[PDB]
Amino acid sequence: SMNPPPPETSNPNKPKRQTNQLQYLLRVVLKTLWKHQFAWPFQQPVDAVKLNLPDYYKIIKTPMDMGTIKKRLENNYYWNAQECIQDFNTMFTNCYIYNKPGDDIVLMAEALEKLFLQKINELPTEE
Ligand SMILES: Cc1noc(C)c1-c1ccc2c(c1)[C@](O)(c1ccccc1)CC2
Ligand code: NA
């Protein structure tokens, strides 16, 4: 069995910026989720080999994780906040698609998602 390459975190020709919203996504949103007791499964790509989940990347065709998001934010990879928000939502939705309601991993994603939603509610106006 084999893992796919991780999502892209570097691409010189891609348009990218720093915005105050993107700075908030790193300093508030990512920092908050990353320190959470339930962050650990989401801090790097799902290792389908190590976890013995050979169907994972047959089912999940747009993988995403906070390690990837962290690198994208640190590398100023994004053009806007929406792109980054989409990555978090992809991460959570993948977990719900693959797993079943009430699984520990799903409970963990729910806790992180609740906090995500509370933080992005206070996303600053772009300035
Ligand atoms: C994120 C994620 N999304 O689907 C799976 C499976 C995972 C995943 C990623 C990493 C790990 C586990 C599950 C793991 O099987 C697990 C199981 C129950 C609770 C926490 C982590 C061990 C490490
Ligand atoms: Na994923």
Listed by start position, the domains of the chain span 19-123
Beta carbons of 25 and 86 less than 8 angstroms apart? no
Q: What is the resolution of this structure in A?
A: 1.6
Q: Looking at the CA of 99, which ligand is closest?
A: 1
Count of other CB atoms within 10 angstroms of residue 49: 12
Q: Residue 12: exposed, middle, or buried by beta-carbon count in 10 A (0-12, 13-18, 19+)?
A: exposed
Q: Ligand 1: distance of its center to the CA of 54 in Å?
A: 14
CATH number corresponding to 19-123 = 1.20.920.10
Beta carbons of 71 and 12 less than 8 angstroms apart? no
Residues whose CB is under 5 A from ligand 2 (ion)?
63, 94
Q: What is the 3-state secondary structure (H, E, C) of the chain?
A: CCCCCCCCCCCCCCCCCCCHHHHHHHHHHHHHHHCCCCCHHHCCCCCCCCCCCCCHHHHCCCCCCHHHHHHHHHCCCCCCHHHHHHHHHHHHHHHHHHCCCCCHHHHHHHHHHHHHHHHHCCCCCCC
Q: Ligand 1: distance of its center to the CA of 56 in Å?
A: 11
User: Which atom belonging to ligand 1 lies closest to the Cα atom of 103?
Assistant: 18
Q: How was this structure determined?
A: X-ray
- The residue among 118, 94, 99 whose CA lies nearest residue 33 is 118
